[PDB]
RNA sequence: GGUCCGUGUUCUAAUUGAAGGUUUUAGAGCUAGAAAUAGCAAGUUAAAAUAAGGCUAGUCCGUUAUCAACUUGAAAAAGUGGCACCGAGUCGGUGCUC
RNA sequence: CUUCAAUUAGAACACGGACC
């Protein structure tokens, strides 16, 4: 009952836990059941798992939420214009807005008249005939001096502000091809002085305005420059600028091809591979090639009048008509049978389907391309297709490229056009123009009043905000200053005050000063610097020299004042690593010593650095600089702006003057100065028990208390829901086993993040070698997962050790060879593996490949290296063979590369555990480690698992994850127990760092595995195996009881320590718990479904009708609930007791949670139970008679609640025939297992029986079950390896959660869906604690109302 | 090897501006036919909504994080489940402590 | 409910300089 070990299998989806004894075993306790079930007590084996859905990234939120701002800010300019325009709108027509706002409702509910534009039938059609789309009306105002009807002005300007086009252009609009093409060559010619270009003569506008296909257009420009072919670099530079996909593989002498698109998302990424191969050059020639390309894009939409956009938009439109009317005739004449579907069917992707139907321009367009070819005369309209310019809708996705300047001008023109006629229009021109120019800046964020957490803004004055007065009512300095401060860490040492980058310098001088010990000649004993000695030292030496030397100290100070002719300084280097530099920064510029030595200004001089450190805009500094101008000149001011300070310093200011030592009355900074004869360090000042500082800190630095300190970390939020829940598992254990602080604890995090590489790495190598062995014997893509078949082609069909051409059929005789032996490091990597007829020929075993083979065939190895068949490491190691002995550190690197991960995540949680569990401290100011927190790397965990015949199959059961929690658990222990000598490098505590030499031993294998120096070999797993295949072809054993020599403790006995493991995993019951989670998400799927008359559709708002206005559907419901109460059934509304589940749409939780009963009543339920119901998140575990279990689903929906248990004998089989090749490694170890592969056709039948019995028992998908059994019979005759993996997939109908679709050769078995929740209320129900060992079980057939 | 510093790159946490997908209507459809239905005509755009909605009425906030169950506790957060062995189809039994 | 862009924070890769 005393000494236990526990380990983990951290996972993004999985959380595995086990409870071993210190001797390796699982216990078998009995625990009680909560509820009203005749199952009082239960027997649980200690290990179990907890699975979950992973933690979400706030990006999903982020896109919906910022958008909710614009979607309401959009109408915040729309609302804004009405009011300036509200006054005279009333006189022209009383109801125009009160007719606009009501455009959705059908006329009868809708206010006023169904024609919003005019309210009268005749005129609205009259408008649509002069101007069908608004660009017609948009330009008409710009063209016509004649005053138009006011209403027309309003509608015209709405389409301007709502769709202003991006602000990505910073200024007033220099953007023609003409200006931004000559910058691509003036820098390209700047890029290449020699090898120049001519730019005077070239015309770009006439060549690059043209809508004609790009392919001729890129060709078209080169003929205007004889120098560069289209492949030629410049010629590709434009190709990118055109938006095509050009390849810089030829362009520079680059092995790896580079296809880049200006257009694509990844362009940034792909190109940044290139600027990393070119060195940081040509960011100009590619940005201006984007400038150009972007100055290319706009000219598509500018094809004399003032409104170019309008003109251009009309041009597409009449073009839309000319070709459209042109077209109908050809179908109706040449092949008229397809006119039927083209124009009428919105589902067909015919034209009608493009214009109103869901099909996007792409879908319609792709549909048209084969059609054209059959018709005659088509190709000219097809010319518009290649452009993709044919029959354009005005509003589309490419409309995404406008800047706000293009919209502005016609607005500003439109204003100029009608201002004279509506007087109030010209005076709000300024204001109205400002509605467009306004941009909520990035650095101001939102604009709250401080009642929402996100806004950081501060308002100089308080009044309702407008875009007109935005600049008057906002401190830019505080919107901006705040922006950086929130995201800048406060001190690592004081979390309650921002870090520095004067004080820190004022501190740093004094801190180093304290430890100086001076001995004049007289001094009998070396004494510290006296306090007054400091103030004399600060005044002169540090306020006149940047770095002050030891020689300065003697000469400047010791001779002059104290007349220590000779003297010794023993505390410090010659020149002080600290300095009064920021001080010295100001004397050069402000040049008023008496101003800085002054103490009063110390608050200001510090106030001023932050205000400098924060701002990155030279202008911006001015914003908060001005207040202090009335104290100095302007020429200092212009001298002042320039200087900049950054960096976030190690210390806080409220440590320095905020705390006080209540007894002594001295701050730490006050204390460093003048500490009396016993000067003391600042790090001596943190732990001094006489002083209030260690105890004043303790109240501060725990104010935060765990949802808080872990979400302080950084990384994927998927594992954040791991770590928070992983810790949560840990404490439930001490409840499972009596609040006991354990001996050791093992953690591991598996890594989060191939058939085609294998065939691109062979093709370029028989091409630069030039050989014909690729043309002598041919292969495929899906065959090179065979390492014997993939090590013939990396050695060019010639031996790697013997230089005979390799046979091509009998590879089962040739032998796998790791270059460096498996007793040093265990390598299945591609590079270490070499194929030869004979494993040994690489020479002596204990050594790496023999020195004799390096003299003969070194060159052949070097020969391949140039063809990228083998990595550099592969070659590098075989010269080490030639070189001689792998370094002790190379050996020592093998451990460090085996020893510990580098992911910081495995570190900052092990402090949490240190902090979390090792609460107790000793009375000597140190930390007790009764719990040794072990950090493992999975490959070691995995390799042993694979090394010693225990498999992981993800497909069969979640047991594999929970084992990994166990398997981790044992190994962390057995390491701190056999080698307590390396505890520092992996466990989270200060410990002993000796690795390089002791583990190294020379020449001792037989009594050197017992010396102080534990292991001559590098491999850390060797002792567990009874013997290690001593390198190549020789074998050396390991003593059967393995134990650390020093421990005098059986770290390991080979005979039986495994017997626990093999039998432990054999444990039939592992706890399996699915965290019930209150559901989260949107009220419904975002799509607005057509008008229909089905109840399920959700009204878009309270007024709206689903039966008439459609909207949402498939509403999602956070917790299902169980209720008993009578309901009305029979037109006489007779009372009838019932029992039926219900799903509570997260939409209705707010209505439900506060007042469940009333929400129950509005639904029509009556005689509501008082506090009988259960709140169940999804994933609730049911239990039925016969062991059937079920997991919660919302309506007549249920998934599998029963897991599959499997015997071990069957698991080790199933992966040997899964991995029939790529086993490689040791052939002899392979073959004794290989006998087994065809040896036991029988055990799978028992499996086939093991497999089948579960389906009749639990899932009762009796109609689905039958099909799968037949399919094995289809392939039953076939050899086992191929069949064996076909039944691995078939567990996915037997694997947890809902039935899935799963392949079986050409036979596919659809997923099974359960349509009714009715069955589980008769059943027993479950409530699972997070450990799942404890239970709350409610018999559900007792609670009912007749 | 470490620190710090520049830059570029990607990803994750926040801010801002742009283009959409969609639903209702406005967009009168016209020729012949009892009508149903044949034949032609036109089609691009515009408003309003983009989670219901809530109070603090903000140019706010609403899809992140958190949740086994019980006893409290308004919530947070504390408290609630015998041991030593034999063994295994999801856990049995055994016997000690109760 | 897709996409694109501005600004800042952190983590992982390439290059240069300063210190140990």
């Amino acid at each position: 009952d005393k000494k236990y070990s526990i380990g983990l299998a951290i996972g993004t989806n999985s959380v595995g836990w086990a409870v071993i004894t210190d001797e390796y075993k699982v216990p078998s306790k009995k625990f009680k059941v909560l509820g009203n079930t005749d199952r009082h007590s239960i027997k649980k084996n200690l290990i179990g798992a907890l699975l979950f859905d992973s933690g979400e990234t706030a990006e999903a939120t982020r896109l919906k939420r910022t958008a909710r701002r614009r979607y309401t800010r959009r109408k915040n300019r729309i609302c804004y214009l009405q009011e300036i325009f509200s006054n005279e709108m009333a006189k022209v027509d009383d109801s125009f807005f009160h007719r606009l706002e009501e455009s959705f409702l059908v006329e009868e509910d809708k206010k006023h008249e169904r024609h919003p534009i005019f309210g009268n039938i005749v005129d609205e059609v009259a408008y649509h005939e002069k101007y069908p789309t608004i660009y017609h009306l948009r330009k008409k105002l710009v063209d016509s001096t004649d005053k138009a009807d006011l209403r027309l002005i309003y509608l015209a300007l709405a389409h301007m502000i709502k769709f202003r086009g991006h602000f990505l252009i910073e200024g007033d609009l220099n953007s023609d091809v003409d200006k931004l093409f000559i910058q691509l060559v003036q820098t390209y010619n700047q890029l290449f002085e020699e090898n120049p270009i001519n730019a005077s003569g070239v015309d770009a506008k006439a060549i690059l305005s043209a809508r004609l296909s790009k392919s001729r257009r890129l060709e078209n420009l080169i003929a205007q420059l004889p120098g560069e072919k289209k492949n030629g670099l410049f010629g590709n530079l434009i190709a990118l600028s055109l938006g095509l996909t050009p390849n810089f593989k030829s362009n520079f002498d680059l092995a790896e091809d580079a296809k880049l698109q200006l257009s694509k998302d990844t362009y940034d990424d792909d190109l940044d591979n290139l600027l990393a191969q070119i060195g940081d050059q040509y960011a100009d020639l590619f940005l201006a090639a984007k400038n150009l390309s972007d100055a290319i894009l706009l000219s598509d939409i500018l094809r004399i009048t003032k409104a170019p956009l309008s003109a251009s938009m009309i041009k597409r439109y009449d073009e839309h008509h000319q070709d459209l009317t042109l077209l109908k005739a050809l179908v109706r004449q040449q092949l008229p049978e397809k006119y039927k579907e083209i124009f009428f069917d919105q589902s067909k992707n015919g034209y009608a389907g493009y214009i109103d139907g869901g099909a996007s321009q792409e879908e319609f367009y792709k549909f048209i391309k084969p059609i054209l070819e059959k018709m005659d005369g088509t190709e000219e309209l097809l010319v518009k297709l290649n452009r993709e310019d044919l029959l354009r809708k005005q509003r589309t996705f490419d409309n995404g490229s406008i800047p706000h300047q293009i919209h502005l001008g016609e607005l500003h023109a439109i204003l100029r056009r009608q201002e004279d006629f509506y007087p109030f229009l010209k005076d709000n021109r300024e204001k109205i123009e400002k509605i467009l120019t306004f941009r909520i800046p990035y650095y101001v964020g939102p604009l709250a009043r401080g009642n929402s957490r996100f806004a950081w803004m501060t308002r100089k004055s308080e009044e309702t905000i407008t875009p007109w007065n935005f600049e008057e009512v906002v401190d830019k300095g505080a919107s901006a200053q705040s922006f950086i401060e929130r995201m800048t860490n406060f001190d690592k040492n004081l979390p309650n005050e921002k870090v520095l980058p004067l004080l820190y310098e004022y501190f740093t001088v004094y801190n180093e000063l304290t430890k100086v010990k001076y001995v004049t000649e007289g001094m009998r004993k070396p004494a510290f610097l006296s306090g007054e000695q400091k103030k004399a030292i600060v005044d002169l030496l540090f306020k006149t020299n940047r770095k002050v030397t030891v020689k300065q100290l003697k000469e400047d100070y010791f001779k002059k004042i104290e007349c220590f002719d000779s003297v010794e300084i023993s505390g410090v280097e010659d020149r002080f690593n600290a300095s009064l530099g920021t001080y010295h920064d100001l004397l050069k510029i402000i040049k008023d010593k008496d101003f800085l030595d002054n103490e009063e200004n110390e608050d200001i001089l510090e106030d001023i650095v932050l205000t400098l450190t924060l701002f990155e805009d030279r202008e911006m500094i001015e914003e908060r600089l001005k207040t202090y101008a009335h104290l100095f000149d302007d020429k200092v001011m212009k001298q002042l702006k320039r200087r900049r300070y950054t960096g976030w310093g190690r210390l806080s200011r409220k440590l320095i003057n905020g705390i006080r030592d209540k007894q002594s009355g001295k701050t730490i900074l006050d204390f460093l100065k003048s500490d009396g004869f016993a000067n003391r360090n600042f790090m001596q000042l943190i732990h001094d028990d006489s002083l209030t500082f260690k105890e004043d800190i303790q109240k501060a630095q725990v104010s935060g208390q765990l949802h808080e300190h872990i979400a302080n970390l950084a990384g994927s939020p998927a594992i954040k829901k791991g770590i928070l829940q992983t810790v949560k598992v840990v404490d439930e254990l001490v409840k499972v086993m009596g609040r006991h602080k354990p001996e050791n604890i093992v953690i591991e995090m598996a890594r989060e993040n191939n058939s085609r590489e294998r065939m691109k790495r062979i093709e370029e190598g028989i091409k630069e070698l030039g050989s014909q062995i690729l043309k002598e014997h041919p292969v495929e893509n899906t065959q090179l997962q065979n390492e014997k078949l993939y090590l013939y082609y990396l050695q060019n069909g010639r031996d790697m050790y013997v230089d005979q051409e390799l046979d091509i059929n009998r590879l089962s005789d040739y032998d796998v060879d790791a270059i460096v032996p498996q007793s040093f490091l265990k390598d299945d990597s591609i590079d270490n593996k070499v194929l030869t007829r004979s494993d040994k020929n690489r020479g002596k075993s204990d050594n790496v490949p023999s020195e004799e083979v390096v003299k003969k065939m070194k060159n052949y190895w070097r020969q391949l290296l140039n063809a990228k068949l083998i990595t550099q490491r592969k070659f590098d190691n075989l010269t080490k063979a030639e070189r001689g002995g792998l370094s002790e550190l190379d050996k020592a690197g093998f451990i460090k590369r085996q020893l510990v991960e580098t992911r910081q995540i495995t570190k900052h949680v092990a402090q949490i555990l240190d902090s979390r569990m090792n609460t107790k401290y000793d009375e000597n100011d140190k930390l007790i480690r009764e719990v040794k927190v072990i950090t493992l790397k999975s490959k070691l965990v995995s390799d042993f698992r694979k090394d010693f015949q225990f498999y992981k199959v993800r497909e069969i059961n979640n047991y594999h994850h929970a084992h990994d929690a166990y398997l981790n658990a044992v190994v962390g222990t057995a390491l701190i127990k056999k080698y307590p000598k390396l505890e520092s490098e992996f466990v989270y505590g200060d410990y002993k760092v000796y690795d390089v030499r002791k583990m190294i031993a020379k020449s001792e294998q037989e009594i050197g595995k017992a010396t102080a120096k534990y292991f001559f070999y590098s491999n850390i797993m060797n002792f567990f195996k009874t013997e290690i295949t001593l390198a190549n072809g020789e074998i050396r054993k390991r003593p059967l009881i393995e134990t650390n020599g020093e421990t005098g403790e059986i770290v390991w006995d080979k005979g039986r320590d495994f017997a626990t493991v093999r039998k432990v995993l054999s444990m039939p019951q592992v706890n399996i718990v699915k965290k019930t989670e209150v559901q989260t998400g949107g009220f419904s799927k975002e799509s607005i479904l057509p008008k229909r008359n089905s109840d399920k559709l959700i009204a878009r708002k309270k007024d709206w009708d689903p039966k008439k206005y459609g909207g949402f559907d498939s509403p999602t419901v956070a917790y299902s609930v169980l209720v008993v109460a009578k309901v009305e059934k029979g037109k006489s509304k007779k009372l009838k007791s019932v029992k039926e589940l219900l799903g509570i749409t997260i939409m209705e939780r707010s209505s439900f949670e506060k007042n469940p009963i009333d929400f129950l009543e509005a639904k029509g339920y009556k005689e509501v139970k008082k506090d009988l119901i259960i709140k169940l998140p999804k994933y609730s575990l049911f239990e039925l008679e016969n062991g059937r279990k079920r997991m919660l689903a919302s309506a007549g929906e249920l998934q599998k609640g029963n897991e599959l248990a499997l015997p071990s004998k069957y698991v080790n089989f199933l992966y040997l025939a899964s991995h029939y090749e790529k086993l490689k490694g040791s052939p002899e170890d392979n073959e004794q297992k290989q006998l087994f592969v065809e040896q036991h056709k029988h055990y799978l039948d028992e499996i086939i029986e093991q497999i089948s019995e579960f389906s009749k028992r639990v899932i009762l998908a009796d109609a689905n079950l039958d099909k799968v059994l037949s399919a094995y019979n289809k392939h039953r005759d076939k050899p086992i390896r191929e069949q064996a993996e076909n039944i691995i997939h078939l567990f996915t109908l037997t694997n947890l959660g809902a039935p899935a679709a799963f392949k079986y050769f050409d036979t596919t078995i659809d997923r099974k869906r359960y349509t009714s929740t009715k069955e589980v209320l008769d059943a027993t129900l479950i409530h699972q604690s997070i450990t799942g060992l404890y239970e709350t079980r409610i018999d559900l057939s007792q609670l009912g109302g007749d």
Side-chain angles (χ1 to χ4, degrees), chain A residues 959-986:
Chain A
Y959 305 17
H960 74 312
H961 253 125
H963 314 149
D964 282 15
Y966 188 128
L967 314 156
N968 294 206
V970 180
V971 179
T973 44
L975 161 62
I976 71 204
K977 252 165 54 180
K978 180 81 176 83
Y979 304 168
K981 306 207 44 84
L982 284 162
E983 231 168 325
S984 64
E985 10 283 285
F986 28 100

Side-chain angles (χ1 to χ4, degrees), chain A residues 592-634:
Chain A
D592 190 313
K593 194 145 157 51
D594 295 69
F595 186 86
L596 309 176
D597 296 357
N598 212 17
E599 205 281 346
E600 314 148 321
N601 311 312
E602 179 175 44
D603 191 346
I604 298 177
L605 313 167
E606 266 294 351
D607 174 299
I608 201 118
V609 181
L610 224 100
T611 17
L612 171 50
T613 8
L614 246 11
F615 300 43
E616 70 257 334
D617 225 318
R618 185 199 264 198
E619 157 186 40
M620 211 21 75
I621 299 134
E622 292 213 60
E623 224 296 333
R624 298 184 162 287
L625 168 281
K626 311 164 228 300
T627 311
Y628 324 129
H630 50 223
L631 242 195
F632 334 114
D633 201 276
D634 183 51

Side-chain angles (χ1 to χ4, degrees), chain A residues 277-280 282-293:
Chain A
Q277 302 163 45
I278 309 185
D280 178 65
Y282 324 138
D284 301 322
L285 279 64
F286 280 86
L287 174 61
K290 174 210 99 72
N291 295 345
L292 168 70
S293 187

Side-chain angles (χ1 to χ4, degrees), chain A residues 706-763:
Chain A
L706 259 61
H707 291 43
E708 314 301 332
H709 182 254
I710 301 195
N712 288 347
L713 307 163
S716 187
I719 207 67
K720 268 194 193 171
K721 193 150 195 157
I723 330 145
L724 167 45
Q725 299 250 311
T726 345
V727 168
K728 184 180 174 204
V729 184
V730 195
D731 280 333
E732 191 134 299
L733 94 78
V734 284
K735 215 201 179 74
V736 189
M737 271 82 223
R739 322 144 165 90
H740 254 149
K741 313 194 192 191
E743 187 198 0
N744 327 297
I745 272 171
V746 177
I747 62 175
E748 145 188 337
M749 321 177 45
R751 199 159 317 279
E752 216 173 350
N753 270 328
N754 302 94
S755 315
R756 267 134 297 171
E757 273 217 15
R758 306 284 190 95
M759 248 315 269
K760 188 110 289 189
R761 297 172 53 188
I762 294 178
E763 224 146 35

Side-chain angles (χ1 to χ4, degrees), chain A residues 443-444 456-460 470-471 473-486 610-612 614-617 619-628:
Chain A
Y443 55 45
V444 167
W456 62 79
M457 221 281 310
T458 88
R459 323 105 85 72
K460 295 199 194 76
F470 166 42
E471 299 240 280
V473 193
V474 171
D475 184 307
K476 301 271 249 246
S479 356
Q481 203 187 263
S482 310
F483 195 7
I484 297 266
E485 292 203 350
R486 55 171 243 176
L610 224 100
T611 17
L612 171 50
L614 246 11
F615 300 43
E616 70 257 334
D617 225 318
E619 157 186 40
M620 211 21 75
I621 299 134
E622 292 213 60
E623 224 296 333
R624 298 184 162 287
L625 168 281
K626 311 164 228 300
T627 311
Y628 324 129

Side-chain angles (χ1 to χ4, degrees), chain A residues 489-492 494-500 651-656 658:
Chain A
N489 245 116
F490 319 127
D491 238 14
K492 293 217 171 192
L494 252 209
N496 332 100
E497 178 134 273
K498 273 127 311 119
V499 313
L500 319 194
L651 238 194
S652 152
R653 174 188 182 177
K654 283 173 185 97
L655 232 176
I656 268 176

Side-chain angles (χ1 to χ4, degrees), chain A residues 87-175 177 180-190 192-193 195-204 206-210:
Chain A
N87 281 318
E88 292 256 27
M89 160 56 50
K91 285 182 270 134
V92 176
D93 187 325
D94 76 328
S95 307
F96 185 47
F97 313 151
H98 265 164
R99 282 205 307 268
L100 275 187
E101 296 188 1
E102 293 84 347
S103 48
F104 201 89
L105 283 169
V106 210
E107 74 305 55
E108 30 183 285
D109 206 58
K110 177 201 286 198
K111 321 268 152 132
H112 309 256
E113 338 300 316
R114 72 170 144 185
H115 284 40
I117 326 194
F118 293 143
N120 60 76
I121 162 72
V122 182
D123 299 320
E124 161 130 11
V125 176
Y127 157 82
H128 266 107
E129 309 278 1
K130 240 168 167 186
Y131 326 125
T133 98
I134 183 58
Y135 297 122
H136 311 90
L137 190 75
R138 181 184 175 111
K139 164 170 164 306
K140 299 316 174 163
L141 317 161
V142 189
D143 273 16
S144 173
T145 343
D146 317 278
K147 170 194 194 272
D149 182 276
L150 163 63
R151 285 165 315 190
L152 288 187
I153 305 184
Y154 175 32
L155 211 185
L157 301 231
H159 198 304
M160 291 234 187
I161 293 298
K162 186 164 178 179
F163 318 92
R164 41 182 192 178
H166 65 53
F167 276 57
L168 312 178
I169 294 201
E170 242 71 7
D172 321 325
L173 222 64
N174 74 83
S175 302
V177 161
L180 262 55
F181 181 82
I182 84 168
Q183 196 50 224
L184 174 88
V185 311
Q186 181 197 4
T187 57
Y188 190 90
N189 261 42
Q190 176 167 323
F192 318 140
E193 179 193 62
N195 229 14
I197 300 308
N198 76 315
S200 337
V202 186
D203 212 40
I207 295 177
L208 240 296
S209 309

